[PDB]
Amino acid sequence: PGMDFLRSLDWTQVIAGQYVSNPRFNISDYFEIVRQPGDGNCFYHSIAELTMPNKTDHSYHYIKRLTESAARKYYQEEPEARLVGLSLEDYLKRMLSDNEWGSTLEASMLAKEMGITIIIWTVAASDEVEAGIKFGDGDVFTAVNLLHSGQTHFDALRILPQFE
Amino acid sequence: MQIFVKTLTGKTITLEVEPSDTIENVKAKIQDKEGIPPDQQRLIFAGKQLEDGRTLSDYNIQKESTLHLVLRLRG
């Protein structure tokens, strides 16, 4: 019934392969937070934490290269890339630079590139969930879950065992 | 006229608009009512992310139409 809650999240597909949800709850009541470094790379650390065996501070480098590949394949079709306003080539140079922030754009492409579902949970300073944005058709159990906090930071999330 | 915007947090708001207002104009209205910065806004209607330079009429957004607001999240 705990996992029934999560399994019963209400996802509205607003654009192909992109869903929004508005549940209300404390992130920490359902997920374990796995804090990531406070450098400019936390988005990639967070993905690394959840996708790579024996993750470390340098693992993110591999996800940044996955992002490059995904971009060459998807960037020019990504609706959100229209907010970036960069040629594919300029974007690649910028994205690849050290300590460059990640975002919902990289999430959308990585989901496609990696064949997985990625969910970004955005929270108030109180760690209450304002919204989830989902890239991919998967559900929360199969997804890579990220926590977006302070409007500027990503950490990794794992579902708590009792709900797994 | 009036249209509705459902924000990312699920809140439905109303906006005072004309059919000749540009999507960019609309985003600016939303910044004025709800404080959300235009740079973060992705307005969506009938499965399409709306383009800033176009008007509501260009998309056949009629009275009491409901747009969806998704946000660009960096970090």
UniProtKB/Swiss-Prot annotation, chain A:
Domain OTU: 31-160
Active site (catalytic residues): 42, 153, 155
Effect of substituting residue 79 to D: Complete loss of deISGylation and debubiquitination activities
Region (Essential for the vOTU enzymatic activity): 3-30
Phenotype when changing residue 155 to A: 40-fold loss of proteolytic activity
TM annotation in the entry: none
Superkingdom assignment: Viruses
Described function: Displays RNA-directed RNA polymerase, deubiquitinating and deISGylase activities. RNA-dependent RNA polymerase is responsible for replication and transcription of the viral RNA genome. During transcription, synthesizes subgenomic RNAs and assures their capping by a cap-snatching mechanism, which involves the endonuclease activity cleaving the host capped pre-mRNAs. These short capped RNAs are then used as primers for viral transcription.
Family: Belongs to the Bunyavirales RNA polymerase family.
Extra remark: Classified as His(+) endonuclease since it has a histidine upstream of the active site that coordinates the first cation.
Free-text comment about domains: The viral OTU domain (vOTU) and its N-terminal extension is responsible for ubiquitin and ISG15 binding and for the deubiquitination and deISGylation activities.
Subunit comment: Interacts (via N-terminus) with host ISG15 (via C-terminus); the deISGylase activity of the viral protein interferes with antiviral signaling pathways mediated by NF-kappaB and IRF signalings. Interacts with host ubiquitin.
Name of the molecule in the record: RNA-directed RNA polymerase L
Gene coding for it: L
Residues of the full protein shown: 1 to 162 of 3945
